[PDB]
């Protein structure tokens with residue numbers, strides 16, 4: 277618990293709160309600390325992570341939510357597993373990946389999203405969940421080369437029985453329908469589809485780093501040469517919705533079977549119409565088969 281955790285190093289900032297590398301009984305763990313005025317964000321994220329049957333190898337492992345009074349003010353804590361590599365963003369900026377490495381990153385990410393999206397029926401049932409803010413900066417890389425999804429604070433949970441959501445993201449990754457406000461937020465399926473579009477962008481970031489024969493593209497965020505670094509909804513909307521542009525597909529990707537499969541998936545994730553996009557499960561299937569080949 278928070279009572280015996282010692283913070284050692286600042287390792288990042290979340291939408292709200294700061295992330296630290298702490299030690300729990302000698303073991304390294306990750307700690308996200310919120311202020312008293314950020315209680316709703318802290319609570320909502322703790323709520324999502326405590327969803328029944330949520331644990332999965334491709335979802336950040338949640339340890340606990342707690343309060344810690346230092347004598348002057350109260351800190352609101354969330355504790356999880358610690359991954360030295362940090363975000364996929366950091367990973368892709370620092371390294372290049374092999375074909376096998378790329379598939380593992382993409383496959384693990386898709387498996388995590390498919391788990392989130394999938395409703396598990398049963399007495400201890402897991403509701404379908406949509407992320408709403410998927411990006412390379414909140415996907416983490418484990419020591420074994422696989423990814424796990426984090427930052428579930430903006431997630432929404434579905435109630436299949438009544439087809440309603442339990443409650444009422446990053447501009448660059450916002451889906452077309454989100455950018456132009458045409459998305460039907462009363463339809464849970466629309467949130468799932470919007471997540472697919474974002475995963476498509478992430479896949480593009482990974483593929484660029486797939487080095488074959490010492491050849492590869494430099495790391496870049498999707499739309500790096502079409503919009504400013506911290507783009508607004510309008511700037512994104514004009515490019516994605518009006519000009520209808522998507523990340524450029526290097527001709528180099530046509531030389532490798534793996535890259536060809538990855539590219540096809542991306543295209544099928546970027547359709548302006550969410551209903552036309554692939555599902556996380558289908559993507560997982562395709563990547564799983566490619567992995568076997």
Ligand SMILES: Cc1cccc(-c2nc(Nc3ccncc3)c3ccccc3n2)n1
Pocket residue numbers: 287288289290291295306307308321325336338354355356357358359360361362363413414415416426427
């Ligand atoms: C629920 C919870 C508890 C503790 C930390 C985080 C967290 N951690 C991030 N990083 C890392 C986690 C583990 N090892 C290294 C880095 C996040 C990164 C981006 C957005 C949210 C994060 N939340 N979330």
